[PDB]
Design a protein around this ligand. Structure first.
Ligand SMILES: Nc1ncnc2c1ncn2[C@@H]1O[C@H](COP(=O)(O)OP(=O)(O)O)[C@@H](O)[C@H]1O
Ligand SMILES: [Mg+2]
Length: 310
């Protein structure tokens, strides 16, 4: 058994390979720097950073592995995973739809054989034995439980997963690491919002259209496109505080009175890299320390862990 843990998110796909190497390609694949192929040859796509264009595929849901917008990424994951196989895949999808979405994922990948072709004519064949699935938010909880960054006890943990499109909050009861369904939800407010809050912002003062990835970067660090130096953090406050507040307010709205049973607050996901610390005020000195580099990967890391435990 090779074990991979995989997290195909609207923005980035995240994968954890052999001896826990961390692959991660932007979640986008257009048909035509590897061309790969699930059809043996007939068909062929670029993925990741090197797909630019108009007829460009993307995920239309978080954690939707049975989706036809997802396959070429999964395929592309098992590529960069580094099998020198018989793999188990550990993954997640949000709690709201957790059950349906597990079902499709098993139909589309359990006991099936993804056959795939890259440069200089190379076949690789993964037989997928099983699919372990855990809700998004739980993946990240475990991994931190395994690392001792959190521990079991009385009270409730709140994993706040800042994503690219959605912010995904999962209230978990520490006694038993079981999610509290009624106290668990998804905002449709992510990082893009801060991004576009910026691309938009540029032209409405500067002049041209500032494209995706400079815009992404610009949230955390300054930029240049056409010898034009647009972007930077002291500007970026007025955005990310709103992004942050919107997220925060919306959490008080959902959680309420029940914000008193909260012992740990657990910023996770890529965006906690900008507005993470800002989340203390929901319930202060319940924050839980996590290495910046571990934030986009807490879930995948935990989906794989889960995979081994069985
Ligand atoms: N180290 C980084 N520095 C600044 N921002 C980051 C960093 N890593 C991730 N982010 C931001 O958080 C965003 C979303 O996180 P992520 O969960 O990876 O995407 P997804 O929404 O697909 O789950 C990223 O797209 C990126 O803009
Ligand atoms: Mg995500």
């Amino acid at each position: 058994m090779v074990v991979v843990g995989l997290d195909v998110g609207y923005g980035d796909t995240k994968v954890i390979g052999v001896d826990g190497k961390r692959i991660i390609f932007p979640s986008r694949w257009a048909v035509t720097i590897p061309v790969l192929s699930t059809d043996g040859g007939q068909t062929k796509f670029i993925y990741g950073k090197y797909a630019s264009g108009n007829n460009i595929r993307v995920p239309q849901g978080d954690g939707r592995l049975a989706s036809k917008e997802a396959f070429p990424l999964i395929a592309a994951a098992l590529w960069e995973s580094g099998i020198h196989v018989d793999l188990v895949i550990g993954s997640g999808t949000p709690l709201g739809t957790f059950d349906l979405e597990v079902k499709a994922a098993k139909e589309a990948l359990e006991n099936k054989v993804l056959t795939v072709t890259g440069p200089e004519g190379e076949v690789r064949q993964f037989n997928i034995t099983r699919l372990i699935m855990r809700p998004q938010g739980v993946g990240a909880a475990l991994y931190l439980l395994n690392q001792g960054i959190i521990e079991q006890q009385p009270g409730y943990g709140v994993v706040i997963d800042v994503g690219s499109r959605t912010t995904d909050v999962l209230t978990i009861n520490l006694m038993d690491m079981e999610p509290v369904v009624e106290l668990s939800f998804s905002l449709q407010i992510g990082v893009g919002d801060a991004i576009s809050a910026l691309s938009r912002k540029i032209a409405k003062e500067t002049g041209f259209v500032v494209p995706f990835d400079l815009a992404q970067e610009a949230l955390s660090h300054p930029v240049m496109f056409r010898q034009k130096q647009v972007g930077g953090p002291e500007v970026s406050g007025p955005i990310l505080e709103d992004l942050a507040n919107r997220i925060i307010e919306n959490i008080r709205l959902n959680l309420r009175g029940e914000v008193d049973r909260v012992t740990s607050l657990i910023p996770v996901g890529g965006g906690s890299n900008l507005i993470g610390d800002r989340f203390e005020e929901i319930a202060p000195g319940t924050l839980v320390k996590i290495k910046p580099e571990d934030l986009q990967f807490a879930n995948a890391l935990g989906y794989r862990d889960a995979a081994e435990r069985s």
